[PDB]
Design an enzyme around this catalytic site. Structure first.
Site, PDB file in Angstrom:
ATOM      1  N   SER A   1       0.894  -1.176   0.228  1.00 45.89           N
ATOM      2  CA  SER A   1      -0.088  -0.137  -0.508  1.00 45.89           C
ATOM      3  C   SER A   1       0.738   1.622   0.696  1.00 45.89           C
ATOM      4  O   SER A   1       0.035   2.535   0.061  1.00 45.89           O
ATOM      5  CB  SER A   1      -1.672   0.324   1.044  1.00 45.89           C
ATOM      6  OG  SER A   1      -1.880  -0.829   1.010  1.00 45.89           O
TER       7      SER A   1
ATOM      8  N   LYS B   1      -0.045   3.961  -3.414  1.00 51.16           N
ATOM      9  CA  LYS B   1      -1.229   4.597  -3.195  1.00 51.16           C
ATOM     10  C   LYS B   1      -0.845   6.098  -2.368  1.00 51.16           C
ATOM     11  O   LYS B   1      -1.779   6.633  -3.863  1.00 51.16           O
ATOM     12  CB  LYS B   1      -2.008   3.880  -1.817  1.00 51.16           C
ATOM     13  CG  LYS B   1      -2.290   3.189  -2.145  1.00 51.16           C
ATOM     14  CD  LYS B   1      -3.279   2.130  -0.937  1.00 51.16           C
ATOM     15  CE  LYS B   1      -4.059   0.912  -1.189  1.00 51.16           C
ATOM     16  NZ  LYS B   1      -4.640  -0.185   0.315  1.00 51.16           N
TER      17      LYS B   1
ATOM     18  N   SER C   1      -6.112   3.546   3.989  1.00 52.70           N
ATOM     19  CA  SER C   1      -5.026   2.624   2.964  1.00 52.70           C
ATOM     20  C   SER C   1      -6.414   1.950   2.787  1.00 52.70           C
ATOM     21  O   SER C   1      -6.480   0.767   2.425  1.00 52.70           O
ATOM     22  CB  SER C   1      -5.171   1.292   3.924  1.00 52.70           C
ATOM     23  OG  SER C   1      -2.978   0.926   3.174  1.00 52.70           O
TER      24      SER C   1
ATOM     25  N   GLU D   1      -5.432  -3.438  -6.575  1.00 55.31           N
ATOM     26  CA  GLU D   1      -5.349  -4.603  -5.653  1.00 55.31           C
ATOM     27  C   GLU D   1      -6.564  -5.576  -5.184  1.00 55.31           C
ATOM     28  O   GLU D   1      -8.064  -5.626  -6.171  1.00 55.31           O
ATOM     29  CB  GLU D   1      -6.235  -3.709  -4.710  1.00 55.31           C
ATOM     30  CG  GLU D   1      -5.274  -1.974  -4.103  1.00 55.31           C
ATOM     31  CD  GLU D   1      -4.196  -3.105  -3.152  1.00 55.31           C
ATOM     32  OE1 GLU D   1      -4.063  -3.663  -2.581  1.00 55.31           O
ATOM     33  OE2 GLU D   1      -3.351  -1.719  -2.660  1.00 55.31           O
TER      34      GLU D   1
ATOM     35  N   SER E   1       1.495  -3.365   4.190  1.00 54.15           N
ATOM     36  CA  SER E   1       1.099  -4.597   4.773  1.00 54.15           C
ATOM     37  C   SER E   1       1.208  -5.374   3.282  1.00 54.15           C
ATOM     38  O   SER E   1       0.382  -5.061   2.881  1.00 54.15           O
ATOM     39  CB  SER E   1       0.361  -4.731   5.507  1.00 54.15           C
ATOM     40  OG  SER E   1      -0.975  -4.654   5.512  1.00 54.15           O
TER      41      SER E   1
HETATM   42  B1  LIG Z   1      -2.055  -1.677   1.890  1.00 60.10           B
HETATM   43  O1  LIG Z   1      -0.631  -2.680   2.007  1.00 60.10           O
HETATM   44  O2  LIG Z   1      -2.619  -1.715   2.973  1.00 60.10           O
HETATM   45  C1  LIG Z   1      -3.825  -2.432   3.913  1.00 60.10           C
HETATM   46  C2  LIG Z   1      -4.241  -3.182   2.678  1.00 60.10           C
HETATM   47  C3  LIG Z   1      -5.044  -4.320   2.746  1.00 60.10           C
HETATM   48  O3  LIG Z   1      -4.497  -5.503   1.341  1.00 60.10           O
HETATM   49  O4  LIG Z   1      -3.402  -3.016   1.433  1.00 60.10           O
END
Ligand SMILES: *[B@@]1([O])O[C][C]([C][O])O1
EC number: 3.5.2.6
Length: 261
Positions: free
Chosen positions: A43, A46, A103, A139, A210
């Protein structure tokens, strides 16, 4: 240096693979640990998607207020904010905020789509001089974090430099830059990561990440009181596919870095 010995020892105690890049904007010095190795971004990607939309808004002045529909089919695995607006709309601003500060994975997918796919996010990276960042998937599959898989990776060095340009430099217009900084400062998921290793008086804006293989990431801009800001990227991944997150490693790395200053 002392810091690299301590980071190496931290890494050894953790059983995983740690990547760190610090840029001290005061003298532009850099501290690197595995700074040129690839890590799964998860993430932390992002930030690039939000920044790309921000860049688009420089010309499309009203873009961030554009409503986008949230349909049930859009929902993926983790949608704390998009969940609240199913069968309704969220503006591109609200989706950027949700992607960064909570997130939200659905929000990230709407940003990717706004940019014409993962290739659109990667293109923005190249446009600001980041030739290392690569986004290949949406995602949630970009979080698989498979060892050796180059998809959806960057290096700590490359990410630190790019995060510096987006937040402290002028890769973005003044208004867009300020908005990104405001969004990062209001991140809600980072209390146990880099923030936890730093003085409470320091202002921090960060984006956590994560994924599988215990991948535990955090990228941050840091404003110490009275001192020049710093950019700190901490990437951590482990050899077991089902390993648990290790945010404590990110805090310990941050603490070790803060000691050296
Ligand atoms: B990112 O990594 O932070 C939370 C989400 C869980 O898939 O993605």
């Amino acid at each position: 240096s002392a810091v690299q010995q301590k980071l190496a020892a931290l890494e050894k105690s953790s059983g995983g693979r740690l990547g760190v890049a610090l840029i001290d904007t005061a003298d532009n010095t850099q501290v690197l640990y595995r700074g040129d190795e690839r890590f799964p971004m998860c993430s932390t990607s992002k930030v690039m998607a939000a920044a790309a939309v921000l860049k688009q808004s420089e010309t499309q002045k009203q873009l961030l207020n554009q409503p986008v529909e949230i349909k049930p089919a859009d929902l993926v695995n983790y949608n704390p904010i998009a969940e609240k607006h199913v069968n309704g709309t969220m503006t591109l601003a609200e989706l950027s905020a949700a992607a960064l500060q909570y997130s939200d994975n659905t929000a990230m997918n709407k940003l990717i789509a706004q940019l014409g796919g993962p290739g659109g996010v990667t293109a923005f990276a190249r446009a600001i001089g980041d030739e290392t960042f690569r986004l290949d998937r949406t995602e949630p599959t970009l979080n698989t974090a498979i060892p050796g898989d180059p998809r959806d990776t960057t290096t700590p060095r490359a990410m630190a430099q790019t995060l510096r340009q987006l937040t402290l430099g002028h890769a973005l217009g003044e208004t867009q830059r300020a908005q990104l900084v405001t969004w990062l400062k209001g991140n809600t998921t980072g209390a146990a990561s880099i923030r936890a290793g730093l003085p409470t008086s320091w202002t921090v804006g960060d984006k956590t990440g994560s994924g599988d293989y215990g991948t535990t990431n955090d990228i941050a801009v840091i404003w110490p009181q009275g001192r020049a800001p710093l950019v700190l990227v901490t990437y951590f991944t482990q050899p077991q596919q089902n390993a648990e997150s290790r945010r404590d490693v990110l805090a310990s790395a941050a603490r070790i870095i803060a000691e050296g200053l």
